[PDB]
Design a protein around this ligand. Structure first.
Ligand SMILES: Cc1cn([C@H]2C[C@H](O)[C@@H](COP(=O)(O)O)O2)c(=O)[nH]c1=O
Ligand SMILES: [Mn+2]
Ligand SMILES: [Mn+2]
Ligand SMILES: [Mn+2]
Length: 676
DNA sequence: TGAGGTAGTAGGTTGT
DNA sequence: TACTACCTCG
DNA sequence: ACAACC
């Protein structure tokens, strides 16, 4: 195709030695379990037995494969699972050769490779080993804490029969003191804490003045002798009474608690510039390679293609959405905005007034600025003021306020939403020279009033693009969809989300949401779209889009479905020259990496991994549209999002519905991006 | 609540 | 998934 | 348990 340069890149992967003739013929084992596992427990049981055997062994089909000879294995024993007891016996059955060309057998080989890496790393010193991560050096150290530097690794087997090493530098934050000693250093309370005696964590709420030897526990025991009776005080001291929270406040001891340290609990930048991350990636790869007898690492190369530069349009061409404030909007209607001040002051700050007037003047659209002379503490009278403002044509409200606590922020926003009013919060004190902050607030306000601040100018295969995501922080989730309608993406819409149990969006929900976007397109363009681009956040669960694809096909609407994965893309580095944006790296059929955003100061970019799950549009064209769609987001004035706009929008939508609840959205217009 | 991504920290679902 | 620190403003 | 995502 017509690319803007064919270049070569390094992946953080490394080619290593071919598997030797022993490794290609692992020892096979038949598994006998007594009692036989239930349907639910069979695979975890086989895996558990594989772990229990020792050496380097994994599950292979209904049986086992090992790179250790059975004479150093534990072939018989006893398992506990979910409160049961299984006797296991392993019967050696010789060795069967595995073909790397065959993806199943290659999968078994790769499981073995990973196990190999685990085991050989565990036998090392002196390095901190955690799973597939290795922390070698000490990056930083403070009173009672330290940050280790190392790398997260993976090891698998290519179809040519060789080892492949993945490496990505990582840091790990360690506390080495008890909650007692920790607070005994002047350090303030950690938000989260772990038991000293096992892995369970709690949310630390406050300290108590109570006596542990006198605090009754449900059941008769006191705190102190409860923990004593379990042998937890055998080797340490009780300390004070910490009140932690249930996953209902719960008593605990400061002597039996270890803070879990985050960045909030601690000048330490843990993001690396891409040159340094590349360099360390190599260092650690060669190190691993030499320590494990896996050969000299060969960095793998891939053909990359530079995508065309996106042309962002306001009233005229812009390089960033914030420019639409000086130049004018892509499409500006007659608008009314209202002001709500919670800081006891009066009227619109003059520079905000001037900026808004300037933008709308450049757009040639009229602007009315209202003021809410009411306050949330008035109760229902406040709601009546909101209603009246809505009746007078106010589309969204700017809230000037001191920083609000999360719950108050949520309550106020939800309340305004119930009167059909999206809100943009802007914190005071606010100086005129804090330009990025209040210009971004204004862009938020405007998208929330339903204006199109920018659009795309290019030509794309799909004239409707819709993103699907699931969100919410509870036992249930909201599945939702957002969309850009028209080839220019000159209309951004959300749809009413749906509650669901998990990550999978029900097939009927997927289709009903999609149909809503089709209908939005119909309302805008007076016709059905020729082709639609379906974007799924993360993986597509099996058959999730089946009904939707069937429905689209019945209507004669073409489609492409792309899984968009925010991790698993690894790292990409330039072979020569500077690292740039808009990088398309085709890996295998229907799969490719896309480097959508990057700034040097911002650390090392994490390229997206994309899978073309259905449709016949060429990979380059999809890469082109998704990359350009990344530039459509209106509410970020100075930095484009990594995700294409429909997904970024969908993510924010289901996040906000998760926070506020869906019950507030009935009177909010779907063109008003209330969640940005 | 200014925004973004990269970083860290905790956890979860899908599915073999 | 979702939180916060950091750094800077296509 | 484990993998590959969230
Ligand atoms: C046994 C028991 C413990 N607890 C609290 C005290 C311990 O600090 C906390 C955690 O105990 P655990 O780690 O054994 O689960 O549970 C109660 O609140 N009620 C009880 O009946
Ligand atoms: Mn998601
Ligand atoms: Mn999301
Ligand atoms: Mn916002």
């Amino acid at each position: 195709m017509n690319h803007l340069g064919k270049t070569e890149v390094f992946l953080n992967r490394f080619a290593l030695r071919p598997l030797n003739p022993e490794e290609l013929r692992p020892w096979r084992l038949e598994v006998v379990l007594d009692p036989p596992p239930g349907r639910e427990e069979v695979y975890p049981l086989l895996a558990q037995v594989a772990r229990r055997a020792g050496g380097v062994t994994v599950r292979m089909g209904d049986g086992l494969a090992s790179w250790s000879p059975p004479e150093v294995l534990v072939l018989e024993g006893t398992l506990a699972r979910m409160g049961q007891t299984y006797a296991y016996r392993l019967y050696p059955k010789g060795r069967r050769p595995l073909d790397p060309k065959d993806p199943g057998e290659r999968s078994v080989l790769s499981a073995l490779a990973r196990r190999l890496l685990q085991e050989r790393l565990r036998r090392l010193e002196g390095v901190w080993v955690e799973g597939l991560a290795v922390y070698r050096r000490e990056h930083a150290r403070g009173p009672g804490w330290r940050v280790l530097g190392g790398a997260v690794l993976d090891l698998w087997v290519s179809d040519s029969g060789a080892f492949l090493l993945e490496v990505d530098p990582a840091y790990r934050i360690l506390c080495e003191m008890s909650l007692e000693a920790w607070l005994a250093q002047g350090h303030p309370l950690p938000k989260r804490v772990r038991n000293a005696y096992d892995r369970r964590t709690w949310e630390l709420l406050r300290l108590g003045e109570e006596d542990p030897k006198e605090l009754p526990l449900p059941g008769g025991l006191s705190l102190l002798d409860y923990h004593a009776s379990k042998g937890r005080l055998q080797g340490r001291e009780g300390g004070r009474v910490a009140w932690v929270a249930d996953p209902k406040p719960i008593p605990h001891l400061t002597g039996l608690l270890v803070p879990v340290l985050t960045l909030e609990d601690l000048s330490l930048a843990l993001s690396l510039p891409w040159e340094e991350r590349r360099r360390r990636t190599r260092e650690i790869a060669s190190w691993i390679g030499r320590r494990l007898g896996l050969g000299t690492p060969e960095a793998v190369r891939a053909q990359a293609y530079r995508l065309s530069i996106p042309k962002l349009m306001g009233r005229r061409a812009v390089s960033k959405p914030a420019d639409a404030l000086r130049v004018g909007f892509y499409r500006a209607q007659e608008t009314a905005l209202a002001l709500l001040r919670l800081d006891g002051a009066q009227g619109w700050p003059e520079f905000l007034r001037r900026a808004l007037l300037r933008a709308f003047g450049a757009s040639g659209a009229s602007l009315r600025l209202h003021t809410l002379h009411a306050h949330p503490s008035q109760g229902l009278a406040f709601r009546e003021a909101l209603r009246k403002a809505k009746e007078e044509g106010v589309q969204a409200v700017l809230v000037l306020t001191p920083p609000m606590a999360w719950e108050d922020r949520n309550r106020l926003k939800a309340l305004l939403l119930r009167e059909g009013l999206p809100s943009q919060i802007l914190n005071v004190p606010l100086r005129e020279e804090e330009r990025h902050r209040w210009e971004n607030a204004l862009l938020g306000l405007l998208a929330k009033a339903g204006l199109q601040v920018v659009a795309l100018s290019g030509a794309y295969p799909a004239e409707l693009a819709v993103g699907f995501d699931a969100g919410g922080r509870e036992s249930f989730r909201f599945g939702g969809a957002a969309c850009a309608v028209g080839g220019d993406g000159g209309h951004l819409l959300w749809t009413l989300p749906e509650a669901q149990a998990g990550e999978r969006i029900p097939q009927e929900v997927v289709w009903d949401l999609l149909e809503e976007t089709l209908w939005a397109f119909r309302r805008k363009a007076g016709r059905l779209p020729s082709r639609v681009l379906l974007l799924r956040d993360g993986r597509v669960p099996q058959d999730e889009f089946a009904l939707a694809l069937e429905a689209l096909a019945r209507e004669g609407i073409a489609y492409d479905l792309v899984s968009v994965r925010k991790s698993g893309g690894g790292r990409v580095y330039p072979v020569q020259g500077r690292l740039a944006d808009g990088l398309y790296v085709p890996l295998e059929d229907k799969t490719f990496l896309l480097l959508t955003v990057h700034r040097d100061f911002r650390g090392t970019p994490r390229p997206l991994k994309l899978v073309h799950e259905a449709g016949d549009t060429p990979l380059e064209a999809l890469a082109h549209q998704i990359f350009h769609l990344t530039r459509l987001y209106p509410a970020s004035g100075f930095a484009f999002p990594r995700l294409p706009a429909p997904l970024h929008l969908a993510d924010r939508l289901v996040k906000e519905v998760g926070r506020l609840g869906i019950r507030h959205l009935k009177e909010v217009d779907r063109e008003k991006l209330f969640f940005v």
